[PDB]
Design a protein around this nucleic acid. Sequence first.
DNA 1: TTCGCACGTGCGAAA
DNA 2: TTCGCACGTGCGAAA
Lengths: 436, 436
Amino acid sequence: KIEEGKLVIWINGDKGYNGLAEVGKKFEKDTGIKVTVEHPDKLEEKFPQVAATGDGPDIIFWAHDRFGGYAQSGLLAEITPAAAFQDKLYPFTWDAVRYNGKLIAYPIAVEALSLIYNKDLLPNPPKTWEEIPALDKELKAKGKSALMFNLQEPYFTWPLIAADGGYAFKYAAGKYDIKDVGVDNAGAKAGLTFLVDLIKNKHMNADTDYSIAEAAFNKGETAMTINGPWAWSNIDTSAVNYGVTVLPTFKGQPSKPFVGVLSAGINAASPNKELAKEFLENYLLTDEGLEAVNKDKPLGAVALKSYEEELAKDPRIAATMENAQKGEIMPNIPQMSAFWYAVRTAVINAASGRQTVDAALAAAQTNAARRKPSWRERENNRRRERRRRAVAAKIYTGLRAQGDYNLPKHCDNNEVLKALCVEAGWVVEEDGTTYR
Amino acid sequence: KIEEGKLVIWINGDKGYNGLAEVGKKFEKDTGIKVTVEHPDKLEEKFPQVAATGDGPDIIFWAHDRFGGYAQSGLLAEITPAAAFQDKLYPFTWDAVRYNGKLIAYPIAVEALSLIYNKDLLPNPPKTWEEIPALDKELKAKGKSALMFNLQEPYFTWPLIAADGGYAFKYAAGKYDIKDVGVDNAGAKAGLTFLVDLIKNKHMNADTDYSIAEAAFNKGETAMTINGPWAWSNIDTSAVNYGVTVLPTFKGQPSKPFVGVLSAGINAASPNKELAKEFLENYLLTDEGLEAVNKDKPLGAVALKSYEEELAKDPRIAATMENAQKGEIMPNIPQMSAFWYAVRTAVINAASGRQTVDAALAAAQTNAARRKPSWRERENNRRRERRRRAVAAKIYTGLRAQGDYNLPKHCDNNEVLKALCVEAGWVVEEDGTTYR
DNA sequence: TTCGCACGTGCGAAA
DNA sequence: TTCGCACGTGCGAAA
Ligand SMILES: OC[C@H]1O[C@H](O[C@H]2[C@H](O)[C@@H](O)[C@@H](O)O[C@@H]2CO)[C@H](O)[C@@H](O)[C@@H]1O
Ligand SMILES: OC[C@H]1O[C@H](O[C@H]2[C@H](O)[C@@H](O)[C@@H](O)O[C@@H]2CO)[C@H](O)[C@@H](O)[C@@H]1O
């Protein structure tokens, strides 16, 4: 739990938390506040559960697509810095991270997925998804493989599903039609059927995850992988001579990844609101603060106008943005979670053969639009059934008391119902069949 | 699923899976059989779910306490090693992997928790748990702390709980008594009360987990920690000059850590059983094989006598074994999982203040002693309640059909029963109050 | 051991 | 939207 005079941080484990801790130490020595950095599993899930009761960290670090839903359950609101602080940063970044006209986190970077290939096994990477299966055959003879990426999180598979026209939600009339989904359209069918085919033809495995894909590339067993800028520092420590390049096309159409803006939301239950902002704006949104974090794990296209002009000329960042221009920024609406859960179920079930591509995407189309029942709606159901059982319980209580039926020493209510049935002129069989 | 002619292995993320991968690479070089090593989260729980349907890996690596529950479910191949090979390992390691007379896993190493301390900060490690809060007072004056360890897994807190008399199950007459659970006795109460006292007096944090303590000791913010031999390699590459020593005493009695034998079991659904037995016997359980895994992450006191005579020359191993002699080998009985879940819930609830020490431990004793109903018993309950509902359903079906009781278009069963009551000479109030 | 009511939510109906 | 039966398991009783 929170407490005054301290600062705790929740960032994803694949991020530069150790470089984030190097500056929290620089903050501590300056004005006396100990800063600790923790990278918990499933932090984007634990936060909306615990912070309702006042728990959680002072600041949470996640991409912006969840954040509007976090704002909607009242976990942050109304963050305002001065314009000197509002403009040492990019206008598109603020737009994504503002829910209903209110800034809800400090944007920290811009991330997109790109194709990462080893120049040693693949001097010329493939430009198209369609030549991938033939490539894997040439590399399977040498003992290696073509492509391995995270098939568990749909973030990595969406560039291919969207390539031929699948869309999460449609933007029209200055608004996201939170009903209109395009996970069941013919475009999504072409994308997923190709991915499932890659698995059916043994070019990829349906159980592949992050560690499985990251290890196969860093050890040189797989020519290409699909990852974000955070994965670069790990490939740097390995003996792999890699290049970052545009993701391959599918049916002459580009791959369209979902672009994420890493953001720091201040917990509305924190007591360190201003102290945390002291960390945010004055000690880590500086050149030297982003350096310490980027040296550990590359943030990607950082959003600080000052620091980014140094990073934008790294050819790896330039390729990361060639992929992002081809993609779309992620909606921050609360129904992102329902869409992300549904498509995750679709890919996993279609990759494993539990469902057809038709059945998985059709089920995902309805799940991504499903409404979560309110707390009041749940309690209304609970209370109504609680009343029902109470009404029946009182009735049978009186029948067992004053009925004086010929009942066994112990018997369920159905026996009482039967005995009271025959008194009214009915005959009840063994299985409950009743008549006059 | 597992393919014929391939080997896939599951080991915990804190072990040297990269070292184990190099052993598989040599196995691939001599027999042409690819070996893939994965470290998925919650593998101790994932395995009994997938392996029942014939899925899971070929070989699973875990401490020996979980294997008996696996074997009772028929998930493991029975280990058939030559008598000549069984003599190559310490006999008591074979005992940890014996269940119902059969051998069910290949014992790899012996693991016991020890006190790891920073020699530069604390040259003389405290010999007693009770003197630790005083050590923290001196330490807080430097901005440091004394002790930090994983508070989320009961494996780390148990040596304190067991010191003054707590135990899991009592051994008597050649078997463990699953109904004699000692997580509620006075010794276990005092041990946990002390730990909760450390948290109440701000000498330790209840949210502390593995990565938080491992990061803080390696970064030199705490002078002591509690961890097994696997954690040394990260400290080695760190700047801390460290020593491994016996765990401190509590009320004059030593801490009694549960001793675990890292073991490799063979999935019963594996068409590569002969291949898995070959890889474990002639490539891993050798000097060169265990050395490769050990150089990655220290295994501890290996079961193989030939390589252990070399590893025993290590003062850190002779200290790890000094703690082991004061502790106990875990049971491998299937109830161990239920004991681990109960104590895990208790320590977390007590460390957080959600429950008292007396309430949490009393609930842990009933949970760890609760008899898990068999599948058939669960099914019996499900069918009996299904039959009870169908009987009531047929009665209300016939009442609605031949009653003509003069009720609305739609109405619940309670109203039909109400209408039948008045037909038989009763009256029913709104809340169900019923009499003649 | 079996047994039966309680419990909160699922699923779809009826509107 | 509210509604109501079905669902499988919890808890405790009776033995
Ligand atoms: O898989 C759904 C998941 O996708 C995105 O998560 C990314 C995240 O943006 C990256 O920073 C990194 O952590 O990889 C993640 C995928 O594993 C969305 O941001 C997230 O909301 C969504 O759940
Ligand atoms: O915390 C309960 C846990 O204790 C043991 O797990 C140990 C394991 O023996 C070590 O190899 C290492 O991984 O630390 C683990 C605890 O985090 C038991 O073996 C395990 O069954 C139990 O769940």
